[model samples]
Target: KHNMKAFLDELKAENIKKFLYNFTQIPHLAGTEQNFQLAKQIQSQWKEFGLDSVELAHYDVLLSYPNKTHPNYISIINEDGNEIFNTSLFEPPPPGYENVSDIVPPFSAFSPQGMPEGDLVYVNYARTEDFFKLERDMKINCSGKIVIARYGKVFRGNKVKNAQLAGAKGVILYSDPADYFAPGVKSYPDGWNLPGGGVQRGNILNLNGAGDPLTPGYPANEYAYRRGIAEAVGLPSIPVHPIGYYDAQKLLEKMGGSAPPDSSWRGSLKVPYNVGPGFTGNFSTQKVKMHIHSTNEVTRIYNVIGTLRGAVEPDRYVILGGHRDSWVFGGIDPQSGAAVVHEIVRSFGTLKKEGWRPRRTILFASWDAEEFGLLGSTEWAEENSRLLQERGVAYINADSSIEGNYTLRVDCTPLMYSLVHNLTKELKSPDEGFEGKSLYESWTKKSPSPEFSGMPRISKLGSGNDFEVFFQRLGIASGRARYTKNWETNSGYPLYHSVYETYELVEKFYDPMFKYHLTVAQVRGGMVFELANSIVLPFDCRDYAVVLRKYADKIYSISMKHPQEMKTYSVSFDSLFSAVKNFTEIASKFSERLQDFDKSNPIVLRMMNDQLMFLERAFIDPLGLPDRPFYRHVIYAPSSHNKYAGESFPGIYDALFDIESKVDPSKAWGEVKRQIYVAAFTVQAAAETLSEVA
Candidate 1:
């Protein structure tokens, strides 16, 4: 504990600020030259820091890029058969970024390249409910129409795919000022808002699964099998493009429609929100014409893996990860996380020099192509599937550590709650206003949700971060924590995935003093230290039963709430409740033994540690979740409907939603029973392991 405090006392904030500035000075977009350049630099740096081994894992991935010769264009036809104007395909970079012409054009990654022109229609957030309402009450014609949707309510990728299913030809996704900026704050270089020409770029990949789209269920290794572009399950058939509100205004100003949209659907744009088919300037004479000529290429991406072998349990691992790839300058996103990575590595190197050795192997990774679709991390994980399933204890992710917000945001597996809670309570708050208080106190003082097991509320790991592969696909306990603000928060700034997320903004708006960054650095770095160095793996398993029971009840009741004619689809979860009871009892006994284990008896310690880590892995089903075979966790997954937001007991949740919506009721009903059994069996498996060990 004293050594841990010494590590903290030795951490220099100036070092973090220096690294942040250095990384942002050069843009590191994935699938490009600078991306690999940074990867090798991280590899060499980690090797230079006296780590035992350094491995640069590279995969020849199928990635999408902007077709420079023919970029995407959006043009509106005015009255009298004349074209009013067209939008430029590129987002003008901030004043400093003007020289960097290598910025990827504004287009959704993995979307097919095609041009479809028709009357433009407005959809509110483009959620399933929004589309249903559009057709039912509004009674608008969505068939083969171009839809313009503002990006706020749902994942931008969700917006694109939903419109495609609703018979829309193409989608235009724009960031509304009402959503992206704090009130009265200017755009970057001015203050900290998204500028008019500032565009938010993203990948609209089939995140329902992980890894490269071509290699669906397996790794994208040299010997891996791949599916064709057309055969891929998640690839979109429709073309989608992104435009800045500066250009969005042009389209919004022209479009005319049948009745204004419902108030809930409206954003803070100047024009009235409407469901549209006609334009203010054009009606019968002219229509909207959009062009998208994009290309996808089968290329390679890199992942840097640095390992410091464990002195005691060389096979056991506590992995630390951060994606170095970015959409643009990536100052706020990857750079902030990457800076923490270097500082942690440097700190560990110093500890190593002082003759300190961890009990388990510490793996540090800089993932590539995470922005494209978690390509690098997913591939490496699948390639080492057996090894990770056996030895990987936890995956700790540090991405966007300082998201220009004050609160400590956490998304994690239930196993890591106590580890996180204790750390937060011990760490000093970055805010001087809350004098002498801990980080957890500061967080609770703002907004508290003491939900699961009376612990401070934390979210489940979903898609959009590096943890998806480890937690969702591989069933390793994982966590992504940072000082962040969600897009929905009114005062929160939205430099997320935008070209305007620059170094100056991070310095000016996010963390001018860099205290929050340093605070997160201590917390996350402390976790890695404790996990690797502790005699017993830092985990809380009793809460696992409580959370599982709660989610099982929630999903089982979904069928009842929806009132299905298929009463057989409704699950009883009696078996799961029994299994959870067994798990809770055994987990409590194991917890008792764990606390009392002898220091000299490494054999008993190793035996308990193996059971402890594998208890999480026991949740993985070889058959995987009903439809989502890539995501193996029975408890947690990104919603099939929404990419970033998580769903609990997803197999049952998917089955319930499908039954309610009548999306293959026979399959959903069957899977409801199938998944209920799986959930019970997985919980029973954990209980059996714990009981046998005790």
Candidate 2:
């Protein structure tokens, strides 16, 4: 094991640099020929990397694209209905990517096609709270208006959802300068900040269900029963579009009504920030409109799955994955991750030739169509649901290996917390300033954990990437690892999902030497060996219990603060609190037993590992959350309000503590009590799973 770690560290960075170039050299959208060809390239490479078996898993799913001939755009029209300004629908390719002609034009995936015209209303980030503040606090109505919102805060889809619920005719999203361009920073051809023409593109599907929209609870494989467009779950009904700040600045300049009350609602644009129901001031008579033209089709996408069989426990599997598809040339969003996966495979092949084999099976997946809502990985997991539930030990995801090169960011389940912490302690820091020190040494100083005072924070798993099915739906333990940048005012990496995400941006700005990419691969490979080769699985159920307790306490404290408002409702966290206490006791006892367990006996080893494996699975409720039947885990699922981050006891939290209840007050209070019972029952059941192993 020591030798393997040394070998992983010594792997060539030049090889990884070459892989990154090839992966991003072409425009490879999911379901397109280029993406499939890239899939073939990976399949061929994996075989040469000495995997025991390599195969391409295919799924027929719905995908969306902008029109090839006629582009979609937003136009500023006067009361006379003459178009004055039309938004540009494409970005100019950067220096190294000028010859790439097959670019997919900027458009939101799954957005319906429509030509909606109305008075434009600026609604901040278009979050649910943003809308509630506008309607309830300011008494502004968005009925029949076209809402323009800046992109940031939550998932872009949720922004559209908020607009649709506010009775808006159409939605226009733009990247705000405050969240894109840092003050006084040079633009993209010279520095890392986004150029004015760079438009961020992504999907707007509801995360309540993930996978193929046409196939809700099942796979989209051949002969599988499929549903119609009307029956799909995650598709957005409203028309949505994304534009660059170059276009957005023109619209913001003409807006009327009151200026933004706080700095949070303001952007760095030269124009005044206003929350408007219609254009006022110099352009009072003018109107804003959008024409969203897109093509949707059911097409085939591939997931490349390669396997190396285990020597002892061939049945148990440890998996690692990264998505292959991008909204455009995903030089950083995914190609960085894909390139790292390729290099990891090469390193594993070298280990195989040197007579090294893991105790449990190792599977590598290069998933397709993740940009369109985790389709490829979700479909594959659904098809193999039974086998995976029984054999899958854990999943480690590496999407966007270097979003920022400042430090490592890991979001995982509590069970893997110890494993991740220990692994980083042994690895060297990427920063040359922290010479001869462990990565953990610099990470703790840079981004310390708020919850666990001394260590670096491990974020909770959420539904932004390919870990959705294994972690939230099927109850398998999962985690995501990456190297993220330090942010000043940006929502995400500046070139996220844009055409500007070329190899040049990474080579020049993000990771000039590819050392961060190499470090991520080492972290990923280290995790696989720890899970697949160790005699006893490195899991700590007590950590899970402690985390759960904290989540419950926070919820309870918040609810009590609004006692006057909730005095009429008969809701309490008494049952939920008791359940968490019981779980803590059981987990402590379980941890103690492991200290004296007989690892020499294979039967005892299997029993102990089996108990650890299903602890996460026990959190699953087959009936699923309130309206989110696809997300089964009670403790860990993406926040329904913001799909990018995790929410614990989501059913209870959303029902009781949202800005406004989706249901009526009486029914909402009733729903809150019901969720409390649901959460308590689930927690008690999980405690039973770890109860005295005698």
Candidate 3:
């Protein structure tokens, strides 16, 4: 508490923005020459904070780079077989960011290299369910046709996979006006909304677990075993393209000979949402021809790492990190958080100079190639998996630190929720309207509204960030911070990862005064300090019990409607519920014992910390999920159908509902039972561990 206050007081807005302004000077796409140089510069800057040690750790990843010589080409052909319009594939650069002009044409990374010519079929967003509905409800066959899907629903790579699985040869994705440019509201160049020409660029690497595509369960180091391109899981199997709304409007306008799509598929675009396969029934001429030639090579990407060795226990480690790579300038998605990382490290440096030291060692890392599906951090975690399993305490991440006006947003594993909640209460709010209130008060103490009447909560981690490998795969405690817009009133920022995400846009709208930037910096850096310096490890186990119970209760309540179907499965949660009840009781006592900080025998301290840290690790199963071995956590995994949503007890859930589950339900019961029993035993193991400690 003594050092935490001074650490928070030392951070300022000017220092935070100083780094953010410099990061936007160039487009730091993964594996680019500019990106490597920037990594060196950032690596050298760590000495400014006097971090104990800093190094450039390199990984050999199969990264995708655009072939500018054969630049991606997209042209609209009319019914008369004449090319009406051809996309320039070039976007004008923002002021002070001339290097933006060097960005490759808008293409999804990991998309296959090919020129696919097929009739364009309008699939609504191209989600797994959308394709199923298209075949079932619309009776639309998808063989050999190309799909054009909107981009508001899920990850771009997920849409590509859905299209490929639906028997489509190629894909084109675009953002809709309804979700971006509001009907009556002004757009960018005039307001914060997206103009028709704004492009949303992204990495389309399949989230097939973690790290380099070549090395699966191991790191991308020199001595790792690897698979050939034929067996690589992260590579895409079909050609994919991303287009702007202006280009999408032309194709939608000329679509012909299909029924109006379901009303939910309609957007703000001024045309009826029809399943247009072509114009005037000339399917061949009106078909979309997309040429995207992306090359994949095993190039070296570097992660900049810095360390502050602990005074009491150097072996127990805590990690603080954010990705530094982006599709464009990365001003908001990562640069903002990258700046906060520097300030946080600076605060720790100051405290160290004043003769204070953390009880647990803290590692500060700037991840590279995260935009290519969590490469840098994932590789590092797998590289040090053995040490991390024994010594890794927790991971705290800050990405897109200020994505909104003033609201504070957090997503974390339930075991770490209590720590962040307490931190929010101690920290001040940036909203001037709620001047004297704490962050907790400002967010949860408001009047109840229909859309948001609940208390402030931390949602579970799903995808699109660097924490997945730690919390979900390695079973380490993890949490992330984001400043979000008040969803009650404003729609989100339209230019997410677009070329339009410049420092100018952030100053103009996102954090006009930069108070959100500074406040979040304090929240992020201060949280690390508090956790590091505390005598008792700042983790709570009761919330884990509550969340697990809540998810199980949801399944039980929903299953009541299908008694006949569930009776055959013999699905009973009695063991799970009783184990959780035991966990809650034992955990309450274990936390009390930890709270007694006066007992400072070094051996006892290490034992208590070890027990606290490994509680989350107990959830991991060596056999891994039924089919996805990389996702080892039996309790947390991505839904098999939807790429973004969380799936608790996914093995059982997918077995019963997903169409891809093995055809015989009786044959699959063994897998389902194995997964559920694993989770049940993990809960009991945690309970027993806590009992021993108490």
Candidate 4:
């Protein structure tokens, strides 16, 4: 009861109350004009709060053509000159194909220059294997032909790349009705909707060569040197776009040729799906004008950078950020958390007014353009990578905020796991069993019901949020804060990203209670304050070792599950297990010794924080994982298949799965070894850091 009272008291504080009040006033959506307005408001607010510098940083992006009139989608006419209705409708053309004629085109933003028409061929997902089979068995020359594929198979870029490799001149991707319109399934308007004939158009650049098409390696400054358009490495050779199921239904109905699509190819659409190059005339497309437009408006998009300079170690920093920009009236996506951030800043201001300061600087950033592929954060990090790495201690990101009755999520480096654990224990919740629960526990409890056991594990980091720029790209020790549960089952806001992403809607339906939003602010504010004020950088190698050992054990079990295959690869499960066991023992000892160390010593504390920051780099080798040099971390990385979602124990798990599936054996073996070395190096670095703290 005392704990509950204290929590309530904190919520009622003036600054906390005012922050929440102001949060309701700001509407931030990604890439919209309103988002720009919110950015200005945040800048002004930060200045009002006495921040050191509140400045807007601008980056250039090519604004694609808008979807005004849906393009002239293709229709399949029967040999009798009758148009097929349910099987196929015109779908949007791929980007760079807007002005193409001869082929019925959907509105496209970036269609290729002049192109001749050819026979239309239906391809499965246009995956690598499918392309191979088409080449070998069908003996169909897809060269110069327009290929139609579905949208769900691979990344839009990968699909286009495969089509280009298959020598296809153009590609069209449409969504199947199976996932969208099947019986017993809830369609859009009730849930997340993809309009019947709507298409998704995006860039096909692999993001490997560089980010931002205009400026590849260099910062995108007015005077920055840039490679010519032809010389740029990131642009795709083929066009790609996404189409709704309605468009797919129309196209499928018109095919009157060979056999019907295989059972696997069948969709929920009422008409029969088919694979065809019917006896119709060749499928061809014409060219439209494609010119580059200026994306520079010189408009200020501010990052509200507030700092509580540390007394002892002012140079070292702990940064917390959330993007202030949203797509529309971004109530859930960003405003929810942005509100919490405002509260945290206000809380710190209150603390300052009360004559309290921290030991290390705490910087709060309200980023812009985060929804559009993390553009704002990425550009900022790229421009300041050196300075950030040298002085930044850790980065905590909060993207979407909500008022769920769940615990908070802390997806961070293994080094900080125990610190987060301790922090959770100190926090009190309204519910009895929920108090002191980890963020994962809170989510599990709220997701299902009180009758069910809670989910056992916390969520791992994936791309899509701002953390990707810090943790995945720059190797910074980053964490994401969010409450994900209750929306699907409970009485929460119906609108996610629609015309309903408004403050009035959120205040009415989403966070009506507003307690969860307040809690998020409290937790973040407390964590930031603690990190800044504490003499010792709170970390535990034992927690890291525990999680690492679990991953190692899982890998060993997998190897044993396929002994014959393991023998083929010459992987020693016992050796890997033994290495993990040894490291676990070392970490256990390190944790014990560190517990007795003098935490009040400033020099010792600084040294400990420095070591903690370098722990991620310990696992990285100059030579990255085999076949994927872009990824350096062994344990954590965005999945090659998923693109945006993160995968754990990527080295062994990804490689072993690939090998078992008859993938490249040499590459798999090399990756497994690299993973093992990375794990070992991480443990060793952790041990060394613990030793210094002790």
lDDT of each: 0.80, 0.86, 0.77, 0.56
Q: Any runs in candidate 3 off by more than 4 Å, and if so which?
A: 78-82, 95-101, 182-185, 223-225, 280-285, 446-454, 490-492, 595-600, 659-663, 668-671
Q: Higher-lDDT candidate among 1 and 2?
A: 2
Q: Which ten-residue region of model 4 has the weakest summed lDDT?
A: 286-295
The parts of candidate 2 lying over 4 Å away from their true place are 1-7, 487-490, 564-570, 659-666
Candidate 1 error regions (>4 Å): 78-82, 223-225, 280-284, 450-455, 486-492, 562-571, 597-599, 661-670
What is the Cα-based TM-score of model 4? 0.74
Which of candidates 2 and 3 reaches a greater lDDT? 2
Q: Compose the digit string of candidate 3's lDDT tens values, residues 450-553.
A: 22355575677776678878877888888887788766565246888777787777877777777898888877886787677777787888778778777767
Each model's number of backbone clashes?
A: 0, 2, 0, 31
Quote each prediction's TM-score.
Answer: 0.95, 0.97, 0.94, 0.74
lDDT winner between 1 and 3, please give it: 1
* Deviation in Å, model 3, residue 607 alpha carbon: 2.0
Q: How close is candidate 3 to the true structure, as a TM-score?
A: 0.94
lDDT of 4 by residue, 1-694 (tens): 2222232244433443345455534344344555566667777777665555567766664323333243323444344544443222343322333343322223233334333334456777776666665676666667876677876545555667778888877677766655333344333334333446544433454553134555544555556565666664445555444456666665555543344436666656765555555332342121111112212222223355566676678887788898876544455667777777776665565555555566778888888766444556766776777877678777888777663444455567766655665555555553436656544445445543322364323456666567765676566676666554433432122233333344544454445567666666656655665566666666555666666777777777775776765677676655555656666786677556456657777566556567666666555543655555535665677665545456777766776663655657666676666666665665555456445454
Better of 2 and 4 by TM-score: 2
How well is each residue in 1-694 modelled by candidate 2, as lDDT tens digits? 5355755765667878899899888888999999999999899999998899999999999998888877899999988999999999679888767777788888999898999888888899999889988888888899998989999989998898888889998888999878887667678878888888999999998857558988877899889787878888777778999999999999888788877767888888987788886777678888887888797889999999999888899899899998999877889989998898888888877787777777899999999999898999999999999989999999999688888878888899999999999999998898869989898988887789986677997889888889899999999899888888764333878888888888889999888888898888888878887888888888999999899899899777767766754677778788998999999999899888787877678998888899999999999999998778889999987987789989988888887776254547778777777888999999999998988666
